[PDB]
Amino acid sequence: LKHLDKLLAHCHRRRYTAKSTIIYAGDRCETLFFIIKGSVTILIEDDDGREMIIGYLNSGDFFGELGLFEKEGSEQERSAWVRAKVECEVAEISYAKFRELSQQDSEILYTLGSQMADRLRKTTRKVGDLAFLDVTGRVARTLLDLCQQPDAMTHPDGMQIKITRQEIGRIVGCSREMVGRVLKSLEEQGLVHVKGKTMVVFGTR
Amino acid sequence: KHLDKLLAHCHRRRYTAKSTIIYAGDRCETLFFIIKGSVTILIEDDDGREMIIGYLNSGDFFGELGLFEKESEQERSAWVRAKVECEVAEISYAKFRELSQQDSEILYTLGSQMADRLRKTTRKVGDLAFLDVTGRVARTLLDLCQQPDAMTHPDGMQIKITRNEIGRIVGCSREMVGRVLKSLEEQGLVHVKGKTMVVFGT
Ligand SMILES: Nc1ncnc2c1ncn2[C@@H]1O[C@@H]2COP(=O)(O)O[C@H]2[C@H]1O
Ligand SMILES: Nc1ncnc2c1ncn2[C@@H]1O[C@@H]2COP(=O)(O)O[C@H]2[C@H]1O
């Protein structure tokens, strides 16, 4: 991504502590972000106003990019909340500067497009998971999927991931008590071992 | 500015209603653009149950989600089925990547369509959270009642739809839809009368 060098030269670096909200859904859109270090959580509210975790983005990912685009070329609003998952260092750049550099080098838009396409694939699969799987299947699939994503650690017996019961519940759309019951069953069946802030998922190497 | 500009390098093909244009799991090698018509986007579970993700219309590209992997080429992420007769422009990824190298305008159009699809599909995720199949079918029936192909009825609204079609909207089997409809009749929401259904209230 050497073609991003000229974009990062015009970025202001900001640090966000874990759990701090970077983007609030519904806000105006004038700024694009690039994750230098750390990771962020993408959240929406369901129709009950209850929060659901859509996914995570990691170093090398842009976020806040969808606000560049609108159907009639009118004002656009932030489509989700973005919250630091761990301590994050982000590069912030105005839409106005991004537009000038992307007009100078379309490779920047190829990188942005590649990331948006990946997110659309993942979110489309999430529709299927919510429709096709019951909660036990959704919890198991979430655990397996997280083992293949950044910040999973190779473990002698599988992969180790940084996640809590509450987070899994917000990902799969069930109660915090229900995820406890499901995870207990999955532990007894040999898929997972739950720890304080981490979980070990067996058979994922 | 590039409509005839891009079509100048495109093959034009026609697809009749219900034809599959893209099969999920195939190699991505071709970008499509709808000159006229509309398509349905569908996914499946590992048992062949189908679910509709959404629709694309005249002016929409599709088959684009493998286009930006210049690196490792992707598989088609969904089925694309012609909803009506479609006139489509087609261009290989190879030729498009060369033509678009200094074309930020065309990449911005592709990005804008992907952004629209990401927002809509994210809202669809939110609308599915905490909704079991019976609630999904009920909401679909109420939604179908507000569409222009519905008919008013003394007791409410009358719709024409098959269990197969309901199952594709909610992502379940035809048999499961049948069981749900029997439950919604016992609830008092609907009366199934062969090929049509009456939805009470609304
Ligand atoms: N389904 C999704 N997957 C990944 N990231 C998303 C998703 N929906 C929204 N976002 C991100 O959240 C951001 C919120 O602000 P924007 O709409 O500007 O840009 C959005 C994307 O960067
Ligand atoms: N969530 C979605 N919304 C709209 N269109 C989609 C969605 N998911 C996949 N598609 C389209 O279906 C196509 C299938 O092949 P591709 O993955 O190459 O590109 C895909 C997109 O054009």
DSSP-derived letter for residue B64 is -
Cα B132 from Cα A133, distance rounded (Å): 11
The SS3 of residue B82 is: strand
Distance from CA of A15 to the nearest CA of B (A): 27
8 A C-beta contact, residue A124 and residue B78: yes
- Say if CB A59 and CB A39 are below 8 A apart: yes
Concatenating the DSSP letter of every residue in B83-152 gives SS-EEEEEEEHHHHHHHTTT-HHHHHHHHHHHHHHHHHHHHHHHHHTT--HHHHHHHHHHHHHTSTT-EE
Q: How far is CA B94 from CA A114, B72, B104, in A?
A: 16, 14, 17
Residue position matching structure tokens 């609907």: B190
| Rounded-to-integer distance, Cα A4 and Cα A20, Å | 26
The SS3 call for residue B182 is helix
Three-state DSSP at B19 gives coil
For residue B118, list chain A residues with Cβ-Cβ distance below 8 A: 66, 79, 116, 119-120, 123
By what method was this entry solved?
A: X-ray
The residue extents of the domains of chain A are: 1-133, 134-202
Strand, coil or helix: what is B168?
A: helix
Distance between CA atoms of residues B8 and B106, nearest Å: 14
DSSP symbols for B134-154: HHHHHHHHHHHHTSTT-EEET
How many angstroms is the resolution? 1.8
Sheet holding B11-15, edge to edge: B11-15, B86-92, B30-36, B61-62
User: Residue A117: its chain B contacts at CB < 8 A?
Assistant: 64-68, 114
> Cβ separation of A124 and B66 shorter than 8 Å?
no
| Nearest CA among B45, B70, B87 for reference residue B176 | B45
The position carrying tokens 């080429």 is B73
Nearest chain A alpha carbon to B108: A109
* Residues β-bridged to residue A53: A43
